[PDB]
Design a protein around this ligand. Structure first.
Ligand SMILES: Nc1ncnc2c1ncn2[C@@H]1O[C@H](COP(=O)(O)OP(=O)(O)OC[C@H]2O[C@@H](O)[C@H](O)[C@@H]2O)[C@@H](O)[C@H]1O
Length: 172
């Protein structure tokens, strides 16, 4: 049978949102998901954070394909997305651009970002904008839970952040 989208060890937060303390790259190898989400910039230049880890795991294939896409089509809009190959990690990678709060981009665009998730049944995803782009992780989670109606399995790398998110959620 197909052991595709074989998620295990997630906490169910809502009907359609699950969360786990895991490296999204390790989850990708284990699950072989249809879609993995990248927390991208508009240039798909995969730096630190999730983007760099995903790219490193593809031996730079993601960056080469991303360079090609951007050469052809130009940059994404903040809040926008594109579907590219998941290479050796997944069938597809949904590249989504959260607002860069560190450069004072409108936090409103984080709702636009998560809206992209609704075009896909099942996603393995991180918290958009909550790392290098300097949004409050609890805010990213709230906007995710409030916006996404499809099945999202969130991977949080940092144990302490995972614990703060889960406690903060289960108080309301
Ligand atoms: N390997 C990982 N697995 C799971 N979660 C991770 C991982 N690495 C980081 N995280 C967490 O995922 C969330 C997203 O952080 P970033 O990946 O930095 O995303 P973002 O804030 O949107 O920054 C995007 C920017 O950073 C670059 O990676 C990217 O090219 C873009 O310029 C944060 O909570 C971060 O701690």
């Amino acid at each position: 049978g197909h052991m595709v989208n074989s998620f295990s060890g997630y906490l169910k937060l809502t009907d359609n949102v699950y969360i786990k303390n895991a490296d999204i790259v390790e989850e990708a190898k284990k699950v072989k998901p249809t879609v993995v989400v990248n927390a991208a910039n508009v240039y798909l230049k995969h730096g630190g954070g999730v983007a760099g880890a995903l790219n490193k795991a593809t031996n730079n294939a993601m960056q080469v394909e991303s360079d090609d896409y951007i050469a052809t089509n130009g940059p994404l809009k903040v809040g926008g997305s594109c579907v590219l190959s998941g290479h050796n990690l997944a069938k597809h990678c949904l590249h989504v651009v959260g607002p860069n709060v560190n450069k004072g981009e409108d936090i409103q665009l984080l709702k636009s970002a998560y809206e992209n998730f609704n075009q896909h049944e099942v996603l393995l995803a991180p918290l958009l904008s909550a790392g290098i782009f300097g949004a409050d992780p609890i805010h990213s989670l709230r906007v995710c839970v409030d916006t996404v109606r499809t099945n999202v399995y969130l991977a949080v790398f940092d144990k302490n952040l995972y614990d703060k998110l889960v406690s903060s959620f289960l108080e309301m």
